[PDB]
């Protein structure tokens, strides 16, 4: 649902405070020019005050956290609170294949979203050759993740390989949800974008990497990037592609896939 200026401003005020004097994020931002969309700050070793604010388990403490920060714009509050709004009001507390929030806060001039500190973005990881995943399972993980967003009535609208990230436990999740919007952009434009990401994946990978999986993914991606939306398969048709036969999609959707284990 699309709100009004006063709604967004009101919602901004409803976000809980964070204490910025007790917090190295501001210091890091002032020690450079980092602040642009959003800016990401990694906190590999959260301090006591941040551990308390987020109620981090010892496991979470060891994983680290990342903060997504945006400058509050008083002429357009939507830009700074849209993503917090999605996390608080629209997305389930834990959809298994979507990037989880650990908390949303407002300071004097910034909004904050905390995330688990990811092991990396999928595009970057494959590009550096750091990881050789099971192509079949990764592709299925990616389709499933998108489907889980469509089931909530949301398009992503900016899918790329780096939309996907690998959590410390090895779960691959869909992030970059600040561009998400209700179901011009349609389900078929998300199919196109995911197709382009698959093409990107095949170009990068031409351990668990199998040549027959790559050829099948290339064929699937060619269907997904058809110029005419009507000629592109639905998510349902994609899930019945030859590439995914023998896979239990229910397990993928529950978040049990680990495409980057050998």
Numbering used by the authors: 68 to 103, 106 to 252, 285 to 307, 317 to 372
Q: Paper's wording?
A:
While we were unable to crystallize an active WNG kinase, we readily obtained crystals of the Toxoplasma pseudokinase BPK1 (bradyzoite pseudokinase 1). We solved the structure of BPK1 to 2.5-Å resolution. The BPK1 structure revealed a divergent kinase fold in which the Gly-loop and the first β-strand that stabilizes it (β1 in PKA nomenclature) have been replaced by a helical extension that packs against the top of the N-lobe of the kinase. Remarkably, not only do the WNG kinases lack a Gly-rich primary sequence, the structural elements that compose the motif have been replaced, resulting in a reorganized N-lobe architecture. The core of the kinase fold, however, is remarkably well conserved, supporting our phylogenetic data, which suggest the WNG family diverged from a canonical Ser/Thr kinase fold. Two salt bridges help stabilize the BPK1 N-lobe within the pseudoactive site, including the bridge between the conserved αC-helix Glu and VAIK-Lys. Notably, the lack of the Gly-loop and β1-strand creates an active site that is much more open than that of a canonical kinase, such as PKA. While BPK1 is a confirmed pseudokinase that cannot bind nucleotide, the other canonical motifs essential for catalysis have been conserved in other WNG family members, suggesting they may be active kinases. To better understand how the WNG kinase active site has adapted to bind nucleotide and catalyze phosphoryl transfer without a Gly-loop, we modeled the WNG1/ROP35 active site using the structure of BPK1 as a template. The rearrangement of the WNG active site has resulted in an unusually open active site that may better accommodate such folded or otherwise sterically restricted substrates.
